[PDB]
């Protein structure tokens, strides 16, 4: 029992809990055929929430539904107790299906950068048939995609061959950052997640404040902490897949006018993103290890967390 503690820090929804999920899959408790059943209800809740979100965006943005009966459908969806949902109704299936395929909702969906909408919305609504089946088992990939806010501070210990890594999931939101104090003692390494896809969104916690400008801000502060001078700092530029979608119509240059590189390139964009973060470092002797990740892909993570194992060992063993 040689134990090393690791902090998963990052703003809201950078993909911290998803990482923990992937730990459990690669080196841990496993998600049994049964285990999976437990999530169903939340996948349902996610679906309803996302649609409830898009219906407000229709009001908010004054986007009209193409088919007028979709309003009374949206009315029905409006008024669902999302917690009391346990089964998936045929009327509610009809209502959502109908809405999702309304071109007004689709227009509203296109403009999700202008509002709060889970990144997993499309993944679920397109496989709504598969979900709505009365004998529905969620895949493991379904589970990773689920959006469940983390509140407070939770220790998730995993025994790798040589060592027991003690991982700590925290709340990404402003409200939770005052709590992070409670897990700062005795830290071998920070693992700071950043949603790459966040360069054009605004913050859930406040109106009209750029999400990436937040992360830079936070990263700098964390780095700056003196009780972290002997901790290894590993940066994860996450949601790289969502970046490959996003950069082909939302132009980084309009949010970060520094960017002298070309448009419509995932790579050249993200290399710039990385530079931005590395530059926030004051300490010249402190070297900042990084990675580009998609947290919802297990085969990808394994070549990172096998790699990051090797890094953290070499640092804080020999």
């Amino acid at each position: 029992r040689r134990e090393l503690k690791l902090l998963l820090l990052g703003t809201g929804e950078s993909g911290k809990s998803t990482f923990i999920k992937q730990m459990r899959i690669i080196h841990g408790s496993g998600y049994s055929d049964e285990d999976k059943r437990g999530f169903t209800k939340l996948v349902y809740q996610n679906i309803f929430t996302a649609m409830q979100a898009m219906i407000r965006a229709m009001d908010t943005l004054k986007i009209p539904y193409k088919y007028e009966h979709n309003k009374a459908h949206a009315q029905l969806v409006r008024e669902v107790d999302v917690e009391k949902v346990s089964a998936f109704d045929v009327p509610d299936y009809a209502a959502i299906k109908s809405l999702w395929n309304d071109p007004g909702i689709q227009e509203c969906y296109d403009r999700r950068r202008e509002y709060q909408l889970s990144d997993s919305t499309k993944y679920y609504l397109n496989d709504l048939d598969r979900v709505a089946d009365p004998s529905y088992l969620p895949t493991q990939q379904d589970v990773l995609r689920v959006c469940v806010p983390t509140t407070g501070i939770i220790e998730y210990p995993f025994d790798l061959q040589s060592v027991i890594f003690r991982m700590v999931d925290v709340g990404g939101q402003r409200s939770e950052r005052r709590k992070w104090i409670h897990c700062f003692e005795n830290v071998t390494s920070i693992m700071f997640l950043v949603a790459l896809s966040e360069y054009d969104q605004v913050l859930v916690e406040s109106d009209n404040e750029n999400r990436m400008e937040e992360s830079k801000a936070l990263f700098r502060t964390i780095i700056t902490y003196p009780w972290f001078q002997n901790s290894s700092v590993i940066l994860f530029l996450n949601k790289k897949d969502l970046l490959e979608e996003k950069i082909m119509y939302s132009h980084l240059v309009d949010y970060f006018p520094e960017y002298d590189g070309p448009q419509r390139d995932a790579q050249a964009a993200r290399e710039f993103i990385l530079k931005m973060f590395v530059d926030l470092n004051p300490d010249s002797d402190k070297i900042i290890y990084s990675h580009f990740t998609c947290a919802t892909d297990t085969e990808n993570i394994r070549f990172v967390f096998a790699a990051v194992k090797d890094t953290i060992l070499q640092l804080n063993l020999k």
């Binding site: 437990g38 917690e83 509140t151 402003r174």
Partner: protein, 132 residues
């Protein structure tokens, strides 16, 4: 006294309400949430469950303020993890607060425990020992 039988405590697995029904079960779950620094969700929910039942438009307006400051106002001592939307939705409603002022946020916070802290309570050693 106050102790629950193992059978009694096993029932708390059925659903989140079987736990909350239990006076002790509640005490244990709070203790748990303290251990992970998010007891503010359960206090707030409890705070709402009383407010909901408040009668006189005096208390219905001065409790309205008590809750807001404790949980909603930014940098509030017990600030709960919720959206600027919902928080503002409340802010405005508080001048002439009715029973259904926080009930939006109450529901989210419940779901936020239901789907998160509650499962973990169940996988805790304190609980599993209690089911013996």
């Amino acid at each position: 006294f106050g102790s629950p039988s193992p059978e009694e405590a096993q029932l708390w697995s059925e659903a989140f309400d079987e736990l909350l029904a239990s006076k002790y079960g509640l005490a244990a779950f709070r203790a748990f949430l303290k251990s992970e620094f998010c007891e503010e969700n359960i206090e707030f929910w409890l705070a709402c469950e009383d407010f909901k039942k408040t009668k006189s438009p005096q208390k219905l307006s001065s409790k309205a303020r008590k809750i807001y400051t404790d949980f909603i106002e930014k940098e509030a001592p017990k600030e709960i993890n919720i959206d600027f939307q919902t928080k503002t939705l409340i802010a405005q409603n508080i001048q002439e607060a009715t029973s259904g002022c926080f009930t939006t946020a109450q529901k989210r916070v419940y779901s936020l425990m239901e789907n998160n802290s509650y499962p973990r309570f169940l996988e805790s050693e304190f609980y599993q020992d209690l089911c013996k």
